[PDB]
Design a protein around this ligand. Sequence first.
Ligand SMILES: Cc1ncc(CO)c(CO)c1O
Length: 389
Amino acid sequence: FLPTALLCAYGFFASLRPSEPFLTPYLLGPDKNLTEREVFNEIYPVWTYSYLVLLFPVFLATDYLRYKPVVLLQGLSLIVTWFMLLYAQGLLAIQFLEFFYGIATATEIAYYSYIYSVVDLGMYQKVTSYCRSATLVGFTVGSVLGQILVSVAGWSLFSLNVISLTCVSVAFAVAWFLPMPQKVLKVLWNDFLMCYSSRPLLCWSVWWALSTCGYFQVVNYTQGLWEKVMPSRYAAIYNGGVEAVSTLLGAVAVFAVGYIKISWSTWGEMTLSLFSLLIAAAVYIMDTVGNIWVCYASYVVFRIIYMLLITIATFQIAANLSMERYALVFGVNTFIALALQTLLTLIVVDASGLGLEITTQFLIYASYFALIAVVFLASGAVSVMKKCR
Ligand SMILES: Cc1ncc(CO)c(CO)c1O
């Protein structure tokens, strides 16, 4: 019990990052004095590229080292990331800054998969439910703490990211004392291939991956959009409260998805298409309001619909999937999804390619969110063609 309590405490401390909601005013202010165009155009794409190229090696090293040193890697990466975030000037230094954050984020899969390597299989589901609940409540607590310390307390971000670094150091020091984790050419190629040679095997997969693409593309630059529609020089940004309420409602909706007994085979495609249409409407609205409270509201609704869609996707996949296939499928689909966001980054995001302005990148994205609905409807249309007969 005590190792598991240490696990949940370490996860709570590592996820407790008060500085996550308030990242954007730190860079724009006298703290770094960086051109935000250059930041948006160059700093972030190499993070995505490094995460793509580095996910596979560390994911295989987890099995190579039997999940033991990966938490140490995550802790050291947090330490070096926060040191570099406190000390970095120019362009290449901040490129390394974000490379460190990428190699840190690449080990969240290792964290969430190590839990299976030490506890009983029957108890694994309940303990990982407790772990994700701890992560969610730590996210909410950190967000509200940052909001209180920034607005209610009127404390500057300097002490806030100092205590963020202190918290990640405490997390590493706690995680150092874990117990022992006692636990491919054609076979592994067929291992993921068999997860697509059936009617429901291939289905929902690319849909989940492209929804993941939409979120991982919009969440990073939502901060920039909020800052550009309302400068922080003469305004205060309420990121902590919106993040807290969004995550709380997402968790509530995830819990409530299984609380209604509805068969998937009746109208699963219709619900998926409706969810995609709502997501496209939300992103087009947040593109086309030019205000502050309404754009937060649209963001909240978009987050909620995102959680509903991915949650029902996870139920469908897990019903289709097997007990030992979770890690492999979550690896392969994540890999192809990351290849896809990286590709689209080559088209639009980077300054070497087209480099379209962040403001004007959300126009077509409704049709991008609708194109996945069109092919779902195109698959639905054949299904509708075959439904009556
Ligand atoms: C530490 C840290 N690093 C990177 C990002 C996203 O680029 C975030 C979210 O804005 C963050 O909190």
